[PDB]
Antibody
Framework: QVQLKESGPGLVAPSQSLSITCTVS????????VSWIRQPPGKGLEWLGVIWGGGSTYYNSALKSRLSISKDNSKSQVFLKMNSLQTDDTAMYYCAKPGDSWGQGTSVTVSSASTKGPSVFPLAPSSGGTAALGCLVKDYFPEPVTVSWNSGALTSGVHTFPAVLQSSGLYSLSSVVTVPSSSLGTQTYICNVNHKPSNTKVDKKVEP | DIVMSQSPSSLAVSAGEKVTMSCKSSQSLLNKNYLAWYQQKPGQSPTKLIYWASTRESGVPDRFTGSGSGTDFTLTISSVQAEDLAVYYCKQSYDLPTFGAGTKLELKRSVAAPSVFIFPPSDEQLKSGTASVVCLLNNFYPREAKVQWKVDNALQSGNSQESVTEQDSKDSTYSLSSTLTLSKADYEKHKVYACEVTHQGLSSPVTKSF
């Protein structure tokens, strides 16, 4: 079954150029059109463009001039190129195929600032009937992370908070999971924290 | 481009209710109406629900009803579940596709008190001369809480930030983190750390503390 996978930088400088590729499997691009949609944080969906089978490309009127969509059937790939990026262009970027399935999306932040990986500190459990624990993901930039527990295995009771801005202008969040106090001794909990844009992968033993 | 006008922008609704949301288009969509409806769950990654106005997508429930024609369209949910908590977008495809601004459908539900957990700074972090103390408010409704920190009975201000989750997809509740930030210095000088939480679903304020 069809899947689409986007890949792109995560952070880019204003006025520079953006490149995202969508790698597609489970269908052939001679047969299907792939379109691009972006979503700026807290805003709605905006349609960027599409490339048809023998594409033949159409764009979004407003952005038409800044934008090029091309593809490579052979490599099973579609490219989105955008230039003179402003901070307005900060969005989650998706590619998409009765229709119709979307990629996960790639977060793209336009800022002149540089990348910083997160520090991860454990939120350790202590002294009704259930207990919380967690990890603190402090000062990183840009979005996002992308926190999990036991490399997938744990997904219920888990909350991962939206990133908040520090006065430093860096982001931080916490990821907590609830468990029963009983399980605390015998069960072991590790949080796996990824920050694509800085190439940081961290795992943390969370002990009582 | 064709302007796509969606309404209302937001909808608060108990799980029992039937809800209906409109999407008008500055121009007509008929050649088949090229109107589509999308659903975006707390990200996620939007899924297409309905095309040509009224025909649903594969594996999509019978509760989702698309209707209307030419210029005025409707999306209906018959008995909204908690899992339907999402934002819904319409897309015209007749021209260069454009989306409406969207309708956030929030779930209403009964008042639920928060369970409150507190977390001292980790030894690892303290070796960096900073101290984050965390107070967690689990699974509550409404959104929608006062969190107050006290160090050694001394009320705090300007030294905390809060993050609220999106409403839960299965029970419609919120969770909240409050985070006190201090220097290793200010922290080590003091012994007792408390968050006091007041909330609608709480007879009197609850304080967790170490």
């Amino acid at each position: 079954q069809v899947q689409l996978k986007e890949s792109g930088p995560g952070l880019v400088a204003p006025s520079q150029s953006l490149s995202i590729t969508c790698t597609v499997s489970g269908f052939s691009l001679t047969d299907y059109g792939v379109s691009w949609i972006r979503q700026p944080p807290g805003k709605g969906l905006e349609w960027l463009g599409v490339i048809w089978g023998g594409g033949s490309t159409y764009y979004n009127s407003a952005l038409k001039s800044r934008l090029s969509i091309s593809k490579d059937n052979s490599k099973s790939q579609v490219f989105l190129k955008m230039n003179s990026l402003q901070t307005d262009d900060t969005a989650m970027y998706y590619c998409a195929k009765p229709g119709d399935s979307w990629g996960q999306g790639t977060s793209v932040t336009v800022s002149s600032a540089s990348t910083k990986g997160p520090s991860v500190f454990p939120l350790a459990p202590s002294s009704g009937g259930t207990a919380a624990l967690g990890c603190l993901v402090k000062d990183y930039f840009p979005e996002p992370v992308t926190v999990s527990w036991n490399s997938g295995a744990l997904t219920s009771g888990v909350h991962t908070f939206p990133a908040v801005l520090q006065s430093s202008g860096l982001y931080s969040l916490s990821s907590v999971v609830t468990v029963p106090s009983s399980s605390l001794g015998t069960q072991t909990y590790i949080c796996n924290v990824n920050h694509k844009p800085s190439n940081t992968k961290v795992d943390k033993k969370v002990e009582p | 481009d064709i302007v796509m006008s969606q309404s209302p922008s937001s909808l608060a609704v108990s799980a029992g209710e039937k809800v209906t949301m409109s999407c008008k288009s500055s121009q007509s969509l008929l050649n088949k109406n090229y109107l589509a409806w999308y659903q975006q769950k707390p990200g996620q990654s939007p899924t297409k629900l309905i095309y040509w106005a009224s025909t649903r997508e594969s594996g999509v429930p019978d509760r989702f009803t698309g209707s209307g024609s030419g210029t005025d369209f409707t999306l209906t949910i018959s008995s909204v579940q908690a899992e339907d908590l999402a934002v819904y977008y319409c897309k015209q495809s007749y021209d260069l596709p454009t989306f409406g601004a969207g309708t956030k459908l929030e779930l209403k539900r009964s008042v639920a008190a928060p369970s409150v957990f507190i977390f001292p700074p980790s030894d690892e972090q303290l070796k960096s001369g900073t101290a984050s103390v965390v107070c967690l408010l689990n699974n509550f409704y409404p959104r929608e809480a006062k969190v107050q920190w006290k160090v050694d009975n001394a009320l705090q201000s300007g030294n905390s930030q809060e993050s609220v989750t999106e409403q839960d997809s299965k029970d419609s509740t919120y969770s909240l983190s409050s985070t006190l930030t201090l220097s290793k210095a200010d922290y080590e000088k003091h012994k007792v750390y408390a968050c006091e939480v007041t909330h609608q679903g709480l007879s009197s304020p609850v304080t967790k503390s170490f």
